[PDB]
């Protein structure tokens with residue numbers, strides 16, 4: 001029920017091997033690690049979680065954009081791109097979080113579907 | 116070798132039933148109709164052309180954003196979103212043209228791959 | 231002046247300076263006629279394109295010479311240019327800012343319309 | 346002042362007015378400490394956050410209260426807020442504008458860094 005897709009606006013290509021960390025806000029208001037992975041050759045990251053595991057909550061998807069641009073030898077502006085949202089509060093949904101990256105800019109969007 | 120994908124930033128959903136017209140610049144510098152179609156329930160439009168047909172040239176992909184927002188009962192700013200590019204000039208490539216729409220804004224990106 | 235164009239560079243994190251911009255108005259025969267042009271300043275802005283008297287209701291196209299901009303920086307871009315096509319409407323607010331954010335394979339644009 | 350934040354609304358084509366913005370600086374213990382805050386003006390801009398003397402090199406986070414903005418307009422948004430996290434570096438240019446373009450399910454941000 002959670003997928004992340006990352007594109008590179010400079011190359012005109014998927015952003016491959018981008019690290020992604022997902023957190024969920026805990027009872028005590030701290031960010032607990034939830035899941036993590038790397039985008040594939042398609043710029044997609046699948047398999048982060050299951051419908052059982054992905055309960056209601058406030059989630060933070062951290063896309064490690066600085067590490068991505070540095071691995072490419074470029075000095076970018078942002079430390080990371082974060083997307084913070086409440087999920088599954090009217091029941092289970094499927095979420096795609098897409099991000100389009102440039103060295104000094106990013107854009108993100110969500111696609112939310114009801115299975 | 117040509118796909119168009121359109122997302123809606125207001126709904127958080129694919130932009131469905133968006134009309135798309137493709138033109139190719141002719142010998143005489145006019146825009147000749149090349150192909151057209153509508154996005155599906157996934158916001159994707161497949162099947163516009165073939166690798167034989169999609170020769171080198173300058174192409175214009177016109178995404179009919181006004182008609183999309185009007186069909187939804189909304190008065191938007193732009194008449195359409197255009198993406199104009201040279202294609203296949205170093206041999207055949209696969210192109211995805213993605214666009215993310217709001218009533219007073221759009222963003223577009225290209226993903227170009229070599230099969 | 232009721233129309234201003236602002237262009238930014240997402241790669242360098244700067245105003246896009248000395249970008250040619252041409253504005254056209256749609257004529258009764260559906261051709262585009264030249265209306266105004268200039269080059270962006272050091273702030274990435276192009277002021278003084280027109281006056282209230284001249285800027286009547288109608289369909290306008292703002293063409294931004296993105297290809298020359300990228301080539302002058304030694305970067306190969308995807309698009310031939312960026313175009314923004316819209317209707318000016320006297321029942322809306324009176325001042326239009328057309329803003330564009332440029333990357334080699336992507337651009338984003340928005341309108342800020344105010345009184 | 347070396348730091349300005351500008352927020353725009355992609356749905357209405359306007360400045361995003363009276364949006365709360367909080368700036369934090371990363372402390373030696375890795376916690377975020379409050380640094381500056383304010384509300385955007387009628388132009389969507391927040392000036393006067395800090396001074397040159399106070400704005401030393403370091404990691405800063407700009408948090409934008411997008412959720413309250415959309416709810417005040419009667420719109421259900423996706424994100425809890427928008428955050429922009431970056432390093433201020435004295436070897437780069439001296440003035441930082443953080444610009445954000447808001448839609449209910451999307452946002453785009455860019456940095457314009459100039460001398």
Ligand SMILES: Oc1c(Br)cc(/C=C/c2ccccc2)cc1Br
Nearest residue numbers: 098099100107108109213215222
């Ligand atoms: O499967 C795709 C593809 Br192909 C492109 C996108 C493009 C997303 C995007 C475009 C402009 C600004 C922000 C995100 C999203 C998804 Br989902």
Ligand SMILES: Oc1c(Br)cc(/C=C/c2ccccc2)cc1Br
Nearest residue numbers: 329331338339340442444446453
């Ligand atoms: O005066 C400005 C500044 Br400074 C930045 C912008 C940024 C616009 C923008 C940001 C993200 C995507 C598309 C456009 C617009 C204006 Br009018």
